[PDB]
Design a protein around this nucleic acid. Structure first.
Lengths: 119, 234, 181, 95, 238, 49, 35, 148, 54, 121, 31
RNA sequence: GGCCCAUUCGGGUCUUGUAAUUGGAAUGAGUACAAUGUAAAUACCUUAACGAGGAACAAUUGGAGGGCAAGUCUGGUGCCAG
């Protein structure tokens, strides 16, 4: 909930550590009818494969749960993702400042608290 | 460049199998056997790496992500091969089972190098690569720069510029046909024409602290990496 | 039952479909880029209008707003990666300077025509929809595919295609068999 | 509204008034008097054509729609079948 | 088309010093001050007139933008017989010899060039034409070669630089006559490739208005050239 | 629909070649002159007013 | 063209072109027939 | 000598393929006045209407005409003098700005016109490939611009 | 020079080969302020060597 | 002063050599002084790239005459061997030409280098 | 500065032994 | 000969038209041998053979104009008009 996508975009440039990119042809959803997977789709998918490998069996998707996880996840795509890069976060309104803001109790409140941080 | 991979018997050099690359632009450019394994990795000019099992006499998988001809490939006991794409200027590692990719790019510019100094040649292409370690590798560029790499950092940890020196300046008797010597000397343009030797060869003994570089300067240079694996010396 | 689902339209009809200038514009655009109907342009115009609406929102915000630098640099990175926005013009006013024919130029059909694999945009379209064009190791048959720079580099004929090294099509081997017979 | 809030209206065909008119495909040929089933108010309607006048006969159900002045209505179906469909011989009128 | 043995039908053009050669093809043609030779390999007509052998040279609109302007139908040209002409951007005699052919022996063409490497051919061409004077100098600094130029009825600008309006301005103030001629060739790519072809031409017409040229007409050089036009003006110092 | 728009577009290009001159690769080979003829008094100039 | 094809007038060269003559021959026949 | 002006190379039939962002708009005197009536400030009104950076441009005739209006229309004169408004020089005798503008749009197909005068909208409409800007309702409106 | 045989199947190969060299030595003369014959001499021996091969 | 002028610096040489390889793959590259010469004659070239280390440099100064007479921008690179490697060809290359094609897939990056060449001149 | 300020917040929002690692270890010994 | 502008008269522009003949390639819907999939089975994915000139392997809807008879009607100042 605190995570908002583009801050990690800056981190990736500012991390100075590589990002484990995948192959160009491996990323089409289905023959071009579904665009390239967004970066998020490649993490949530690998959670499944990493989650499948240990349990030694697949996960079937319930007929009900199928009706809020497949389409909209790929209707956001055709509405948002163009060439596999998400554009939905841009139109959406979020309080970006609060997620970054030092709202934790360890925050500057008096002159001494900020004076400590200089030390 | 015959777009074939012929396997020969060691004892008699007799052909037992021929494996075409099945690509018009698939000229094989570098081959690297997985250490203590039957796996073979073939880097071709078709911008792809093909993976084979020699005991199997069959092709396994094709790897994609280079942006130019793949000149060199190196492998160690692990399946983590490293490759260089020349003009794309990207050093690159694979996991064959996961199929994912690391991208390493040099990112040095003479303008800043001269400023922090206050002849440096821009890198043109990465032609050679050798794996010192499963977690470290070295590359050689066509600006005479040999760079040390780690999987932790995309950029080089350490670079040694103009390793093999600068190419001899062209003779003034061949630079121009003008009789007056001073006229010919101006055609030398001082030192802006001078270019560095290229790293034609670069080999590192596996899991060791030394590696060898090669060029047409006329000498083989042996380098030693530091114990911390953060730098090397001649 | 269980929660229903959100879905959205990728295009919107223009304010007035009937300006002669407008019609001549779709005529030029479909002719140059071989578009099937006006729904593709309506889609691209909708998407570009959304990007511009975001960009003007950011131009409105004062420089050094966290929101502004955030949202705009993210826009610039995405528009660069799709290849529309060149490396030297990474600033939001030039995001405000795009034009739809850039997005049509990024359509896989256009590269299949442009790189020389096809002699025409329509030839490119029939090759793509017929599974003769591969983006690296993967066969793609959608002309509306948006090609990235790294994906632009790797356009080729597919291994299974008769033009990529597979066996001659049904017509060729059929005629060869009849000639032999 | 012509139909008192409805988009279409039923009626019963009483007489084809211009059937005796001389000039072919005439406007007077073209008029048929229809009695609305709702209220018993007799009115007149336009057909698609003298060929399509030929499908319609007396005492058959006809669907009316908004359109010689004085006539504001157009027959669109007869006995639950589209006149245009009959005119294209794509359907047969049920008796 | 114009094959060696055929005959053609040479008549004057609307503009003085310009001729048209009729036939199966129509050629924009003008006479030769140095008969018997071609300057850039151009083709030449011979006419027998009482008998003396007068010669003419063909104008190629594609090579010469001025010739393209004629084909485009420029209304009025200040370049004419007996008028001084100061032509900027003299790469070679491809067009200067043609501009010379209009003015005649009575007039002169003041050819200006910057780079040395074309100048050698321009000097050599100037020898065959006793009225052509090469001033190989940077047109951005007219004062360097004010030594060389007597006054001019019309200034023609072939210079392809972003700051050409300034070069044309400084030359025009020094050397052009009041009510004098100005002709400029514009390539929007050279000035500003970022913006469309047209808007550059709007901007170029503006500068001429601030440094006191009343511009008269513009002509796009299609099909002979892309992204080009020839703007012609009158220098109203008043 | 695709082929119809294709024929319409090539149709539309031609009517533009009729109304106005367009660039078609420029000079190709030796210069053969004005094929349609040169007209003495017709000026296509745009006059600044 | 060769010296033999080079002539004194524009006109008589047009005769040496066989393609022009056949084109002229066929139309005159059509024009007379309609006349 | 007879003169037949060329049709601009920037015009595909009736579609103008040259006018692209950023746009240039010519402002008529009425447009500043009607802009003030609707409380629609000048530059954003094109920004939100056209979704592009716009370079407003005023002629000497328009500058002259705003001045002769009188004290009743001071703020209209001032607003024409905002720095983002560039000025267009004129080399013709008359101060009639309507005839000045039609020539320029006839002359050159890179401008949008901003006006609400009745005599002007009909005349410019006849000129092909010319977008027209007007102020109506609560914000500006663009009629003949395919990119919108 | 093909109308007066200045440079004159194998015979044609020498002519084109010599023509390329002639197109060369023309340059060294034209664009050098004081052209020398050093490059002309080494240029001619290259033509000479080609002669015995064919 | 030198006949070899202007000479692109290290950086600008890199983007130019990026043009030549990518043009070479697209069949938009005519390489060599001789076939560079015709492309100027036909007026089908964006720009002509030459090598400043040629032995002698003299053998390529006919090309700039044609370019500047034809208003074609041009540049010299320090190395011919590097230029030839960029041409996709197993030998050194002293001159190369990129041909005019608005229907090319690499229009933008050529016109990108075009602008820098014009600034250099 | 703001990028870091986000990083400590996630650290705040987000004897030393992991149950899963102990489960992986027996799987590895099982391996 | 084709096209464009124009109430008016006319003006502007050039590679075009076929309601002509002809060649070799590509492949989808269909006809479908298999395996896989699964409690079993359907479906999905993968995959042998066959599969186009009227490619008759024959998508529609709406609108604007015509023109034709030893044809029919109505009104007229003939051969006209509706």
């Amino acid at each position: 909930k605190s995570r908002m996508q583009a801050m990690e975009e800056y981190i990736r440039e500012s991390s100075d550590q590589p990002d484990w990119s995948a192959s160009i042809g491996a990323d089409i959803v289905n023959h071009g009818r579904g665009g390239i997977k967004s970066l998020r789709d490649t993490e949530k998918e690998r959670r499944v494969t990493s989650f499948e490998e240990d349990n030694f069996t697949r996960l079937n998707i319930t007929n009900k749960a199928e009706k809020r996880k497949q389409k909209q996840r790929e209707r956001n795509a055709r509405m948002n993702v163009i060439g596999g890069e998400d554009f939905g976060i841009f139109s959406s309104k979020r309080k970006l400042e609060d997620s970054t803001s030092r709202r934790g109790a360890k925050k500057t409140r008096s002159a001494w608290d900020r004076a400590q941080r200089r030390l | 460049r015959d777009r074939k991979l012929i396997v020969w018997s060691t004892e008699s050099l007799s052909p037992v199998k021929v494996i075409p690359t099945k690509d018009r632009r698939g000229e094989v450019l570098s081959l690297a056997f997985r250490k203590n394994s039957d796996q073979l990795y073939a880097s071709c000019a078709d911008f792809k790496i093909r993976t084979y099992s020699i005991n199997q006499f069959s092709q396994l998988e094709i790897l994609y992500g280079h942006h130019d001809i793949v000149e060199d490939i190196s492998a160690l006991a692990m399946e983590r091969c490293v490759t260089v794409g020349a003009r794309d200027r990207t050093a690159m590692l694979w996991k064959i089972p996961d199929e994912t990719r690391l991208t390493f790019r040099g990112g040095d510019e003479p303008q800043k190098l001269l400023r922090r100094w206050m002849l440096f040649f821009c890198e043109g292409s990465i032609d050679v690569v050798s794996m010192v370690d499963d977690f470290h590798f070295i590359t050689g560029s066509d600006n005479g720069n040999i760079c040390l790499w780690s999987l932790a950092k995309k950029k080089p940890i350490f670079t040694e510029r103009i390793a093999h020196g600068i190419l001899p300046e062209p003779s003034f008797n061949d630079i121009s046909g003008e009789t007056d010597e001073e006229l010919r000397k101006r055609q030398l343009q001082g030192k802006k024409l001078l270019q560095p030797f290229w790293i034609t060869s670069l080999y590192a003994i596996p899991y060791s602290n030394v590696f060898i570089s090669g060029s047409w300067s006329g000498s083989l240079k042996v380098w030693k990496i530091s114990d911390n694996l953060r730098s090397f010396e001649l | 039952p269980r929660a229903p689902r959100t879905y959205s339209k990728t295009y919107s009809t223009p304010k007035r479909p009937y300006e002669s200038s407008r019609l001549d514009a779709e005529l030029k655009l479909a002719g140059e880029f071989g578009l099937k109907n006006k729904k593709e342009i309506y889609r691209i115009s909708f998407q570009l209008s959304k990007i511009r609406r975001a960009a003007r929102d950011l131009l409105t915000r004062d420089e050094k707003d966290p929101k502004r630098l955030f949202e705009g640099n993210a826009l610039i990175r995405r528009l660069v990666r799709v290849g529309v926005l060149s490396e030297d013009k990474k600033k939001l006013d030039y995001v405000l300077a795009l034009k739809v024919e850039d997005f049509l130029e990024r359509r896989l059909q256009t590269q299949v025509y442009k790189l020389g694999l096809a002699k025409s945009v329509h030839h490119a379209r029939v090759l793509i929809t017929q599974r003769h064009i591969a983006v690296g190791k993967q066969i793609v048959n959608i002309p509306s595919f948006m090609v990235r720079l790294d994906s632009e580099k790797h356009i080729d004929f597919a291994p299974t295609s008769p033009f990529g090294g597979a066996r001659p099509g049904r017509v060729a081997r059929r005629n060869a068999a009849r000639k032999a017979e | 509204s012509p139909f008192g809030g409805s988009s279409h209206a039923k009626g019963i065909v009483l007489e084809k008034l211009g059937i005796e008119s001389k000039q072919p495909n005439s406007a007077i040929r073209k008029c048929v008097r229809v009695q609305l089933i709702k209220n018993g108010k007799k009115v007149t309607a336009f057909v698609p054509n003298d060929g399509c006048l030929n499908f319609v006969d007396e005492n058959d159900e006809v669907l009316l729609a908004g359109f010689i002045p004085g006539v504001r209505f157009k027959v669109v179906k007869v006995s639950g079948v589209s006149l245009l469909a009959l005119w294209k011989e794509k359907k047969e009128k049920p008796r | 088309g114009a094959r060696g043995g055929a005959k053609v039908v040479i008549e004057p053009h609307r503009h003085a010093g310009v001729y048209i050669a009729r036939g199966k093809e129509d050629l924009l043609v003008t006479k030769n001050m140095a008969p018997g030779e071609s300057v850039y390999g151009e083709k030449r007509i011979s006419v027998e007139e009482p008998p003396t052998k007068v010669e003419y040279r063909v104008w190629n609109p594609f090579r010469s933008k001025l010739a393209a302007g004629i084909m485009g139908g420029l209304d009025e040209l200040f370049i004419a017989p007996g008028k001084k002409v100061l032509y900027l951007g003299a790469a070679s005699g491809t067009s200067v010899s043609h501009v010379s052919d209009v003015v005649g022996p009575e007039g002169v063409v003041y050819a200006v060039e910057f780079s040395h490497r074309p100048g050698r051919e321009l000097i050599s061409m100037a020898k065959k034409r006793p009225n052509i004077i090469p001033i190989i100098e940077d047109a951005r600094h007219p004062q360097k070669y004010r030594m060389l130029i007597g006054m001019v009825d019309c200034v023609f600008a072939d210079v392809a630089q972003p700051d050409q309006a300034r070069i044309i301005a400084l030359n025009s103030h020094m050397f052009l006559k009041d009510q004098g001629g100005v002709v400029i060739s514009i390539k929007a790519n050279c000035i500003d490739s970022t913006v469309d072809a047209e808007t550059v031409f709007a901007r170029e017409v503006q500068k001429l208005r601030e440094e006191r040229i009343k511009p008269l007409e513009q002509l796009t050089l299609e099909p002979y050239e892309r992204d080009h036009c020839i703007v012609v003006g009158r220098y109203m110092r008043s | 629909s695709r082929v119809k728009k294709r024929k319409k577009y090539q149709k539309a290009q031609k009517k533009l070649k009729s109304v106005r001159a367009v660039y078609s690769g420029g000079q190709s080979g030796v210069y053969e002159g004005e094929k349609t003829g040169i007209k003495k008094g017709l000026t296509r100039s745009v006059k600044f007013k | 063209m060769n010296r033999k094809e080079r002539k004194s007038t524009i006109l008589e060269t047009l005769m040496g072109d066989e393609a022009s003559n056949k084109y002229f021959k066929r139309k005159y026949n059509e024009i007379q027939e309609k006349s | 000598t007879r003169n037949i002006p060329q049709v601009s190379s920037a015009l595909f039939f009736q579609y103008n393929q040259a006018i692209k962002p950023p746009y240039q708009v010519l402002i008529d005197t009425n447009f500043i006045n009607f802009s003030i009536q609707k409380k629609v400030d000048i530059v954003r009104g094109m920004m939100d209407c056209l979704l592009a950076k716009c370079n407003p441009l005023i002629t000497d005739c328009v500058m002259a005409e705003l001045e002769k209006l009188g004290p009743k229309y001071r703020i209209a004169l001032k607003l024409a003098r905002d720095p983002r408004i560039k000025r267009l020089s004129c080399s013709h005798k008359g101060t009639y700005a309507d005839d000045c503008l039609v020539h320029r749009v006839l002359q050159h197909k890179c401008y949008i016109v901003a006006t609400n005068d009745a005599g002007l909208k009909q005349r410019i409409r006849k000129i092909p490939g010319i977008p027209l800007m007007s102020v109506g309702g609560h914000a500006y409106v663009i009629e003949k611009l395919p990119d919108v | 020079g093909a109308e007066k045989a200045l440079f004159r199947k194998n015979k044609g190969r020498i002519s084109r080969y010599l023509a390329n060299k002639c197109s060369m030595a023309s340059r060294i003369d034209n664009y050098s302020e004081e052209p020398s014959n050093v490059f002309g001499s080494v240029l001619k021996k290259q033509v000479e060597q080609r002669l015995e091969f064919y | 002063n030198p006949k070899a002028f202007p000479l692109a610096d290290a950086a600008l040489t890199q983007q130019i050599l990026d043009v030549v390889q990518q043009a070479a793959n697209l069949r938009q590259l005519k390489k060599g002084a001789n076939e560079a010469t015709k492309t100027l004659n036909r007026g089908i070239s964006e720009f002509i790239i030459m090598a400043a280390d040629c032995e002698p440099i003299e053998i390529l100064l006919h090309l700039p005459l044609l370019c500047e007479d034809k208003n074609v921008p041009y540049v010299f690179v320090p190395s011919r061997v590097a230029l030839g490697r960029a041409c996709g060809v197993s030998r050194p290359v002293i001159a190369a030409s990129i041909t005019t094609n608005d229907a090319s897939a690499i229009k933008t990056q050529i016109y990108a280098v075009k602008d820098k060449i014009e600034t250099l001149l | 500065r703001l990028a870091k300020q986000y990083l400590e917040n996630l650290k705040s929002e987000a004897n030393n032994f992991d149950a899963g690692d102990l489960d992986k270890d027996i799987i590895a010994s099982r391996l």
